[PDB]
Design a protein around this ligand. Structure first.
Ligand SMILES: O=C(O)[C@H]1O[C@@H](Sc2ccccc2)[C@H](O)[C@@H](O)[C@@H]1O
Ligand SMILES: O=C(O)[C@H]1O[C@@H](Sc2ccccc2)[C@H](O)[C@@H](O)[C@@H]1O
Ligand SMILES: O=C(O)[C@H]1O[C@@H](Sc2ccccc2)[C@H](O)[C@@H](O)[C@@H]1O
Lengths: 588, 588, 589
């Protein structure tokens, strides 16, 4: 009677964790996927975890059949990966648990280690394989790896129990300004590698101002001593890396062409060690800060930016390749060299496509609003997602800034928490800038926040002409503040329901939105220390907090409609400002 | 920025509680309802409680409009009362918050106090009137009363935020075996009373075996000294009751015809005090236990019962009057003199119709499975629900047993918790028997549970031939057990998907279910200390735990299908058993 | 008890008219739209106008609530502008009244005058602001302007009552051959202007044969003395225009590139006066008639045309910008240099896109079939719509012809009515040719109609091989006729349901339609006084008069289906003929 009398039915599954220490480098690796039709159940009360359906007990010891509350093969079927919310109206608001299962066959051709990768599952994913528990992942927007070598048979049944439940102690908490898309919504892969394989491969230009040195780090799955060979044919590079007890580094002379969004040059890179081979396609660029300047490849830049959520009318958070491309293309049509990917890790393809098509990127973890900053396990969660993000995208030239959070109050525990996050980001990546979206000091109307001393670039959200309705507060704010570092205005904007019009003073109309951009641009363009802006937001996205007739459960601050087929007037305001910058920059 | 940075946003609303102490007696009272169309929003993130939409702050202090996330009058409309889950497939699985608002006008023709009654709302209901917080109710199945006299204007706006969220510390916990129907699903009333009004009125046959004494108790809204007058014309009773500091009692002589299911005799009763008048319609009957016998009006009885949930395909938990009547009518066609209403207070009209049509009842509170028995506030919630139930139904001759819970593990903290609940029920109602569905000691296959010492009647759930598949365990259970008090078999049964057939060994088919009933009846009918049975259950009901192809998210142990249009074979098995008992009863 | 016993409940609203005299020039002006979701009701018995819902009388003089028959904020919501017929199938055949309402805020940064513009509302639009009647507009295809300055508050509620009703005395009458799309179906705008603002601005090449003189006329809202400065940077122009009593004009020398459909050259022009600025984008060209010749910039032209309705499966009469562009693109694919926009003013964007992409235009008012020609108030309404159209489109180089009507009986009252409209057009616009679609004289089978004496170009509708089944009637008609002016065959054609085939003698099929085009072209191409043709019609349109199985409530004379995805065989017959003319023109260079 444990299934109904055990209070803490989850503690037994707090093991087998996928974490940053469990990830393996995927570049160049052949993968079989488990994408497809999985049989499923809505498991509102987490009954599978309690009764242990994955054990498939159909008879007792005395041989009698016993009643059961599942029928795996006769369950309906759902195409994975997906955000289950968009798969049927019945699930749009469902955020409990769902249980998915399917079979697959396994034949080893050589001795090999096998990893299961779950590209993303929000928020908890628990894995069962052939009746046994593998482990779980915490965090909704990051890939999870598990070593399943010892669990495989010739014929296999895998069960995934995925819980969409919101909790105040999670990252994010139960209160955000975006939609709670749940389920397994990025690729599910099987990854065969040699028992000793390349586990991490990091490569980057050394940020020493000379553009002449390239660094590369490699670690193995095994604490053995061996040499690995790194090859970049286009650059005439062929250098052996001495690994001692699984780890090794090399700094070598090379002069690649420096990546920019205008010229997104990328090189093919191959690494071998024993019978293993990984590869990558990488750019080389230097991002640095000097006083108030943001230096890309030595030259001061202005970040002509837009914010973007990972949202889709038909697909929820599981955007397609084409939707990512569309997002990049529209931002460049907008005149953007820069995009703020909020508020969580997007699909890793986004930064790869940004490498190829040319767009600078800001990537962020959902340390959002009222995170339980004093809770040690909440920090372990945030810290792990931060490092998952950084190890996943370490080789992405497009990505220049990591963000450790957004719009958090200026309290002691917040400061202890996020300042150590900032320090963690720096230790994991000597090459990139560290930022966060900070709030304006309301009482003073001033850029003032204890966390800014710990960031390379200050991110500021302000909504003058909207949440702070008096426009005179914008010039006052900028003159009350004289920062030492560069400031990116990471958010401003206003609601505009597509095709809803009015006077400039009717908040929520297109005209008011265009007006807010006019006045926002008129001030921000002449502020010395403002080096970028990513207005909120590229296109309307699902939002549970917006229940008014002129919102309809979408955040209406997009410059385009939610299907991105319609540009609002404010879109053309910003585009004209960015074309002015683009041409003044070419008249130089 | 409280609405986004306040962590414990609900603590401010832990006040103004509707509890048993705030209920008022409704019998005979004229009521204006707030049933009808209410404008509503889906409030997944509880934004209304954080942003305080009920304040209607549309401009700031210097006269600028501010952005808002709601539009009360332009919201869509939902007819209350209802379980919101049955209103639209989009809400079937929604168990977050919804916000409801509407307007009403108020004109007092005379000095009066005004109560708001929410007939039930699962699970939390918070009340706002004209921008002010009135208070809240905890507990999903009991009526909530608040005094809104000091809040009323000539024109009024009332807002109800209702949270269906399941929580381990609630009563029930987050794991039950029935569907989580949410929202305001019983009548919303406005009740006008004299400032000094009759607040409780209790009347009952004195259970002293003489059937010649009637007790009656009255309390007032004010701790004054006055005389009330009780009138029962048909019995020539007209007694004055002396009240001191708001309370008074009387025992008096009367020889009413004693209520039975077979002759459900009911008398009209009226009480007056000052300018107040209340009235009831009650029966007189004695329910007592003597050794192993259950005594109704001095005679031992066997309770031919069925269990029943408050479920409806169309209406969720908000059953109609006709659905209630149907339930009683079908139970009597089954040959029932008794009905277990599981596992929570049903609509108070159930016991009123049972009063009228003649059916003995068991009523229960959802102290179910793994209640947080160690948590003092969980006890406070459970005890209040219990006393809400007892005060609401005190005058219902049909109801003979209160149950303080169901299938809880025999632990120390459960024993402290539930034995104090049984004591509480005895202190609040000296007239009725107190019970609970206990479990069978599985180690010994014996009726053995420390709680049973504190119960007047022992309730037992056993599923021999089903969850315990070997039928031989049932005769063994009954021989291993020699209880000193009456035992009711409060549950047995088996699944049968309607029109799903197989062999008697095919668990989940109609044939196997009929077999289970045959073998259950052949043993139980000859056990001396078994004085009733309420097989589980009358009809199929929604159930989030049953995901198999032959369940389809319904518990399939109904004797009829979920729309009650089809009787399974086991229906006719139990029926012929009960008809045998009715016949042998008459031959005596 | 007036709401129910009052017989003539509309008389009280016959005031505050938006007319031609009430329009303001819009070029270059910044506008705040009132487009978007309006709360609405179907008001089948005109209850809002009788009960005066816009007064929002909720209590009586002693504080009692009184029963009301509306609830503005709790009404459903419709997205305006649109033809309400295509918004929901329940409104397809509805042509009564609907009442629309919304709120909006107003803060003046300056002392200013404000106009409400309703871009188009068919057929009557009654306007209320903050509980007061503003005025109305009569005529379903022209923009209406009211000065609402004195009505505005900080918070405003506006109500529009829009009647779809067809009436025999209206323009058009209750009987036409197109669909009665109803509602507010073009932009609703708020327009802020200085107290003294530029009210009209007309500019055109002087049609004197030299191509070197430009005329520009300006009027103001106020009858005052002042000067306006006109600038055309690209032509190095900067003349002051002296204004007296709010009006003045100027003629000056310039040598612009002359607009043609093949080289549609446009110039930016700006006009300032006081604190006001308007601007426009105009081409310069000459259209005149010399005998039987139509002369564009001095050269004879043949008008390779098609006719076109304002129709859309999805949007009704509320066409989008991209549907307009499509119509132009498909016309040009067909080989057209010309388009007859029938039978009413289309969206003003149509002539603007034609300015830009290069397409000559015929624009027309719905003085159509059995107009009540004897009724003076019907003349007022028609005269108003003609002048509205001319004032709205005066500066569109693409538009070379105004049409005062189509297929009207050759009676005396018709003659008085339509000749006076022709004189009106000429008086209001010295630059453009005036025409109309006249019927064939059935007695003589001859182009003969007393209106033609008043027209610059004769329009002829004929349907030989269709309504006149015997093709021989067509060569007979041309032989019988020797007009002194140029003739455009402004309609011919034949039904063909898309994908419905048969023999050439099966009327209603694709094959019969193609065969009709072969025979019309074979005769019309050799009649030397025929200087153009706008076959009927580019694509199928909704039509309440066509109920057969092979019509399905659509007029099937389109050369393409109603969604414009499918070209019928006859489309290629016309295309081949126009491409022959085009190649012949190139080899004549
Ligand atoms: O309301 C919004 O549109 C956005 O609010 C900001 S937080 C903020 C609110 C007021 C002032 C400054 C910052 C969030 O970062 C964003 O995710 C959300 O969508
Ligand atoms: O499974 C069921 O059908 C029922 O299970 C019982 S608990 C129990 C389980 C095994 C043995 C004894 C008792 C619940 O009281 C009831 O609400 C539910 O519907
Ligand atoms: O019937 C038609 O297809 C068209 O008829 C012509 S009138 C006419 C009829 C016979 C001979 C000459 C002219 C209309 O102008 C047009 O709107 C309509 O669609």
């Amino acid at each position: 009677m444990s299934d109904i009398h055990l209070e803490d039915y989850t503690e037994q599954y707090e093991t087998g964790f996928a974490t940053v220490d469990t990830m393996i480098f995927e570049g160049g690796r052949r993968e079989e996927l488990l994408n497809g039709g999985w049989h499923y159940a809505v498991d509102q009360y987490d009954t599978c975890l309690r009764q242990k359906w994955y054990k498939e007990r159909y008879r007792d010891e005395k041989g009698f059949t016993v009643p059961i509350d599942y029928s795996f093969d006769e369950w309906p079927v759902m195409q994975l990966p997906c955000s289950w919310n968009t798969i049927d109206p019945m699930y749009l608001l469902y955020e409990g648990s769902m249980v998915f299962t399917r079979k697959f066959s396994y034949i080893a051709e050589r001795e090999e280690t096998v990893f299961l990768k779950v590209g993303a599952a929000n928020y908890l994913c628990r894995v069962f394989l052939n009746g046994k528990y593998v482990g779980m992942h915490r965090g909704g927007s990051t890939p999870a790896f598990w070593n399943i070598t010892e669990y495989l048979k010739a014929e296999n049944r895998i069960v995934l129990a995925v819980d969409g439940t919101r909790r105040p102690e999670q990252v994010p908490t139960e209160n955000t300004d975006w939609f709670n898309y749940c389920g397994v919504y990025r690729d599910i892969a099987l990854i065969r590698v040699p028992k000793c394989h390349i586990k991490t491969f990091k490569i980057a230009l050394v940020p020493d101002g000379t553009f002449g040195h390239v660094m590369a780090k490699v670690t193995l799955s095994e604490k053995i001593t061996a040499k690995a060979e790194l090859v970049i044919e286009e650059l005439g590079v062929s250098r052996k890396i001495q690994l001692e007890n699984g780890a090794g580094e090399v700094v070598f002379d090379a002069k690649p062409e420096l990546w920019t969004p205008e010229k997104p040059k990328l090189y093919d890179v191959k690494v071998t060690c024993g019978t293993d081979t990984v590869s990558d396609r990488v750019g080389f660029r230097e991002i640095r800060v000097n006083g108030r300047d943001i230096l890309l490849n030595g030259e001061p830049v202005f970040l002509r930016g837009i914010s973007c959520h990972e949202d889709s009318v038909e697909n929820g958070k599981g955007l397609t390749r084409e939707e990512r491309i569309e997002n990049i293309r529209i931002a460049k049509e907008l005149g953007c060299n820069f995009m703020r990917l909020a508020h969580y890790p997007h699909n890793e393809e986004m930064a790869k496509l940004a490498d190829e098509l040319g767009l600078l990127l800001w990537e962020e973890i959902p340390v959002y609003w009222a995170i339980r900053f004093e809770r040690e396990k909440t920090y372990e969660d945030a810290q792990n997602q931060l490092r998952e993000l950084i190890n996943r995208d370490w080789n992405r030239a497009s990505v220049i800034i990591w963000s450790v959070g957004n719009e958090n109050a200026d309290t002691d525990e917040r400061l202890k928490f996020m300042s150590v996050l900032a320090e963690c980001a720096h230790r994991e990546d000597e090459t990139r800038m560290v930022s966060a979206a900070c709030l304006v000091n309301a009482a003073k109307n001033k850029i003032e926040d204890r966390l800014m001393e710990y960031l390379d670039i200050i991110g500021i959200n302000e909504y003058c002409g909207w949440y702070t309705p008096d426009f005179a507060m914008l010039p006052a704010l900028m003159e009350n503040s004289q920062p030492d570092k560069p400031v990116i205005v990471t958010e401003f904007g206003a609601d505009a329901l597509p095709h809803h019009h009015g006077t400039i003073s009717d908040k929520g109309t297109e005209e008011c939105q265009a007006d807010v951009y006019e006045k926002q641009i008129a001030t921000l363009r002449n502020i010395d220390y403002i080096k970028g802006m990513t207005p909120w937001i590229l296109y309307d996205f699902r939002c549970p907090r917006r229940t008014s007739l002129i919102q309809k459960y979408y955040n209406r601050k997009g410059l385009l409609s939610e299907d991105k087929k319609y540009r609002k007037p404010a879109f053309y305001v910003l585009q004209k400002f960015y074309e002015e910058l683009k041409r003044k920059e070419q008249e130089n």
